[PDB]
Symmetry: C3
Subunit: 216 residues, 3 copies
């Protein structure tokens, strides 16, 4: 083994969002959640036409977006701002017997068949390990918390200590029938310093785009 990942030191002075970040780092600091009833009618039907189940598929669709726009791949290094070359999904796995949950991460690959292979190998392996973090944390990761129990009309996350916490969090809900369409609640949490409403806003339209494309 041996690694090293996407350092991309951004100098904040040549940045077109220099004071925006500056202000939301200090006095105006805040995170924010928005939630959408997401059309998944075509996604689900094409995910059921294949023998895969709706999770790694969706994980992948998000991971793709997170690995398109650098505004989601930002964190704090040695007192400096960086952009990871890649970000990997840290999803929740539930334990029926003990009623607890573990969060674990797979390695992201653009090719869906490659990624699902990594995912399946990881979940078929650690899916029954009771360690809170069975594979531990990793520098370059974003989060997806499954919430399959509830068809929520809002999921707000409310962090105590948000300092430099830029890594975005997705919470996803219990899908439901409504008209012809099958809708499914999805929520994001992002630190305002690294995401203007515009950024979050377009990614939720490309998420709507990619769910109507294919499995991955």
């Amino acid at each position: 083994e041996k690694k090293i990942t996407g350092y991309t030191t951004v100098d904040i002075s040549q940045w077109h969002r220099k004071e925006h970040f500056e202000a939301f780092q200090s006095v105006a600091q805040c995170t924010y959640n928005q939630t959408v009833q997401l059309d998944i009618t075509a996604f689900l039907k094409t995910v059921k036409k294949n023998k895969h189940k709706f999770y790694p598929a969706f994980i992948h669709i998000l991971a793709r977006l997170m690995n398109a726009h650098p505004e989601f791949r930002m964190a704090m290094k040695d007192g400096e701002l960086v952009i990871w070359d890649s970000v990997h999904p840290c999803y929740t796995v539930f334990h029926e017997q003990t009623e607890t949950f573990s969060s674990l991460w797979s390695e992201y690959h653009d090719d869906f068949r490659q990624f699902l292979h990594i995912y399946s190998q990881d979940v078929a392996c650690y899916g029954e390990n009771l360690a809170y973090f069975p594979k531990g944390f990793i520098e370059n990761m974003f989060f997806v918390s499954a919430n399959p129990w509830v068809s929520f009309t809002s999921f707000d996350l409310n962090v105590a200590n948000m300092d430099n916490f830029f890594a975005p969090v997705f919470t996803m809900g219990k899908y439901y029938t409504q008209g012809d369409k099958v809708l499914m609640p999805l929520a994001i949490q992002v630190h305002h310093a690294v995401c203007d409403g515009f950024h979050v806003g377009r990614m939720l339209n490309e998420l709507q785009q990619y769910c109507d494309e294919w499995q991955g």
Copy 2:
């Protein structure tokens, strides 16, 4: 004369969540609010069939569900995690004339006919008292906030401080008519140190049944 109530000094060692809690009490502490659009088509009918004001009937279903699951009835006592043997509801009552509000609790009984009687006797007495807390704090209590004004799609409660804030908060909304169906918005505020999305999920799942079941 005296009272003395509640306690089950939980050892962190044996607990199936020792690290979930530990990490959610420092490093990555937070709370989370989720909201749902609740079917009360069956509840409302049964409640309107009998001489019962809506409010106290709901406060009771919320009561039952708190006193079923150890996870809600948790608080930090003398520097330790305990689970109170029971938890009593603390509901808001509005003052017309002054346009302020008061929260007042009623001792919880599993038998509904008992509780509504203590609730009546409580509000008949204090409902026109202008004290913010006409009866005061009670170690072992959860919250219900009346919000009959807005048919809300979201309601986040954003605590400025959450250290050992474990007692949950409910907020119920202006119900309304839909497709032969009647829906009403509810929200929970919980601390992720004592409440995984699972617990909170099933408690909203039982809330459906208990509402599609009798008054109490």
Copy 3:
């Protein structure tokens, strides 16, 4: 040359919310977000029957409401609670070319035709200024955020440090068709020391009212 706009200073002893404020400024201090699925059917058609841009007309209504109820026009001055005679709308404007946003404020007027003149000029003058605040801070203002990217079911704003931060914050979304009605997602965040659920409640019910009366 010189300004000086007046407060209406509040003494905490005579005020009917003397401990609602004191408590919600200390131990129980918090902010809260609620979102509504606002009906703008009437407000839209009447906007489109005139040659008026939607944004400024809405901004107007919001201010009309803000400047109708003192509870939204409260801030800290010199360790003292005050009430601004009037409060002005601080709205955002987006820049396509640089993918950032700037916030600027127009001076409020009851007369819609007057306000639109002042708005239109402010936007025609500063709309292409790449400065985060081309006009800047003014004590007596409330906030609006354009989020026309997403028909959100929930917008929650999770400010880091809420100390005395009383200025209310609106966020409006991508309006959408839904059977003979056109709904527009809207959210308010307010500080509970100056806004009870009832205060925010009626303001949204009058908001619905004005959106069914005229443009302004």
